[PDB]
Write a protein that binds this ligand. Structure first.
Ligand SMILES: O=C(O)[C@H]1O[C@H](O[C@@H]2[C@H](O)[C@@H](O)[C@@H](O)O[C@@H]2C(=O)O)[C@H](O)[C@@H](O)[C@H]1O
Ligand code: NI
Ligand code: NI
Ligand code: NI
Ligand code: NI
Length: 571
């Protein structure tokens, strides 16, 4: 049976290279690889291609080095990067599944894809940007982006260029080259007023280091075709290093460690974050709000139609990492997030966005690795639901949760597929959080074909915390309350969870009609984890969930359930 949906991810192409992706099926037990052909001639194998181009892949391979007795689910590759092409040329492509026994499947349906024309190179050094400093390069870099024809590529060569908020525009690529560091200014003045998160958000936030923000409007299409690429670094300049400032990782590579702070300690821990909180407070804000709203995130792209992020490293954000607000057709390919343990420094936020994709990423983050947000309370539907996410071939290291949906569940989070990922040391695999006042919820979320080791807290959580009035709400409360339903956990193995809360933990408020429903759990193996705690669940089943070395006497703990089923045999 042929591979489905070979495709080029949005803007995932160049004058000399094209990126291909495709669907792997639910059951990959017999598929050990995929092979890629242009005009019926072999280009190579997905596995070996990923060894060359994916930053996640050496980590994914090493993950299995420990794995005797073959306990861990073996993921398959779903991407292949075709390089060494010529400008403006059409190429045809097919993909075949390769099986354990050496045989291939029938070829996929073909795709034709054309490279782009060689772009107008614009170098920021030609506008007076210089690696020192203290040359603040905001003006040079902005000058370079301003002087940009549609289809340009702005280059930031090797060197450390301090800069304040920059403002991107449609039909461009910003390329950070090997050895380039875009360093955030620590001056709160270089980040002028930026955006409000939601239409009903009352506190204005400053600009991020990199922006695509229309001063008036969030509507998808406000910008179009924005690309940020290259193996260079974006450094937010937010925080001091931790007591132990660098660790050696499991591949023996060096990881930066950023201090873990709070609102009352930012005066000690921050750099950009110190200065922005101090400025906000002298201007009249209390600390709580100054810390929560007034630190610059690393990147905020809003209203963009077609985004492509690739190759770059993220370090040291003053607030959040990468933010996508009201975007369509976003792709994140092979980013390296090194922001542990920057307070609220999540890897990528997806907010009221549609059709998004993250693959080949390395995540080591101060907060959630991938977060999905859809607004909060009654006013939420003024905006699109967060609809359509595909998260594959990533390596999650530390962070508050690999896949997080999201607490902000207002306009609905939906159609989310997380497959063929590896998690090592992450807090949680799948984290679904809301309250009854936020409303909305998450639905049609699939978490499958993932392998996980040494989770710090839990395998899956779905909490729903009913409030209500009990009036403490910053937005209008929700009339129709929040709910999680239609969640699938399938073909997932966890070895070790070193926390103490339940391995699988579902909690609503059934007293107050707040329950989760339609949870389908199939073929999961959990070694050395605590027992489950599942309350307020309906119409759900748990089949072939095997607990070995359980840290407790019995795996299954059920209160307040209706119509579930273990194996399937019932309560
Ligand atoms: O307010 C924001 O900018 C964010 O709110 C929600 O995240 C909260 C934290 O800022 C986040 O880093 C982590 O601690 O979780 C929090 C929560 O969910 O309550 C959204 O989930 C974020 O995407 C963002 O909008
Ligand atoms: Ni090792
Ligand atoms: Ni640093
Ligand atoms: Ni953290
Ligand atoms: Ni948190």
């Amino acid at each position: 049976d042929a591979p489905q949906q070979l495709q080029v991810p949005t803007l995932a192409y160049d004058e000399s290279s094209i990126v291909l992706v495709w669907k792997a099926p639910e059951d990959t037990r017999k598929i050990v690889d995929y092979q890629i052909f242009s005009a019926g001639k072999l280009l190579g194998k997905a596995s070996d291609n990923n060894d060359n181009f994916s930053p996640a892949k050496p980590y994914i391979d090493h993950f299995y080095v420990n794995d005797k007795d073959n306990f861990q689910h073996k993921i398959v590759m779903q991407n292949f990067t075709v390089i060494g092409l010529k400008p403006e040329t059409s190429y045809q492509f097919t993909v075949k599944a390769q099986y354990a026994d050496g045989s291939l499947s029938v070829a996929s349906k073909p795709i034709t894809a054309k490279t782009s024309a060689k772009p107008q190179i614009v170098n920021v050094r030609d506008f007076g940007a210089i690696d020192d400093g203290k040359t603040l390069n905001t003006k040079a870099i902005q000058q370079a982006i301003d002087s940009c024809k549609p289809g340009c590529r702005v280059e930031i060569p090797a060197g450390t260029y301090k800069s304040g908020a920059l403002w991107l525009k449609s039909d461009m690529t910003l390329n950070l080259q090997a050895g380039a560091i875009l360093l955030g200014s620590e001056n709160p003045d270089d980040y002028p007023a930026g955006y409000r998160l939601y239409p009903y958000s009352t506190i204005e936030r400053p600009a991020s280091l990199i922006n695509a923000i229309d001063p008036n409007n969030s509507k998808p299409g406000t910008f179009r075709n924005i690309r940020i690429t290259g193996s260079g670094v974006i450094d937010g300049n937010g925080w001091l290093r931790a007591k132990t400032a660098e660790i050696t990782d499991e591949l023996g590579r060096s990881l930066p460690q950023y201090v873990a702070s709070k609102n009352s300690k930012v005066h000690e821990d921050g750099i950009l974050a110190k200065n922005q909180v101090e400025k906000a407070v002298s201007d009249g804000m209390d600390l709580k709000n100054a810390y929560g709203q007034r630190r610059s995130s690393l990147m905020t792209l809003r209203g963009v139609e077609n985004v492509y992020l690739a190759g770059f490293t993220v370090r040291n954000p003053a607030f959040h990492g990468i933010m996508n607000l009201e975007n369509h057709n976003v792709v994140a390919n092979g980013l390296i997030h090194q922001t542990y343990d920057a307070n609220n420094g999540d890897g990528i936020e997806f907010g009221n966005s549609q059709n998004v994709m993250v693959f080949n990423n390395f995540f080591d983050t101060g907060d959630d690795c991938i977060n999905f947000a859809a607004g909060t309370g009654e006013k939420a539907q003024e905006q699109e639901p967060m609809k359509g996410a595909w998260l594959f071939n990533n390596y999650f290291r530390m962070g508050h949760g690999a896949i997080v949906t999201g607490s902000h569940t207002g306009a609905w989070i939906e159609d989310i597929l997380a497959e063929n990922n590896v998690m090592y040391l992450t807090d949680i695999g799948l984290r679904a959080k809301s309250t009854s006042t936020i409303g909305g919820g998450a639905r049609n979320v699939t978490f499958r074909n993932n392998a996980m080791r040494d989770l710090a807290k839990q395998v899956m959580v779905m909490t729903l915390d009913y409030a209500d009035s009990n009036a403490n709400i910053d937005y209008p409360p929700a009339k129709i309350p929040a709910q999680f339903y239609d969640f699938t956990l399938k073909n997932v193995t966890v070895d070790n969870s070193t926390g103490k809360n339940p391995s699988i933990e579902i909690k609503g408020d059934t007293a107050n009609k707040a329950w989760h429903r339609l949870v389908h759990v199939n073929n999961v193996q959990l070694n050395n984890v605590t027992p489950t705690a599942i309350s307020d669940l309906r119409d759900s089943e748990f089949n072939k969930v095997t607990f070995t070395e359980l840290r407790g006497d019995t795996p299954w703990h059920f209160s307040e359930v209706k119509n579930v089923k273990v194996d399937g045999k019932p309560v």
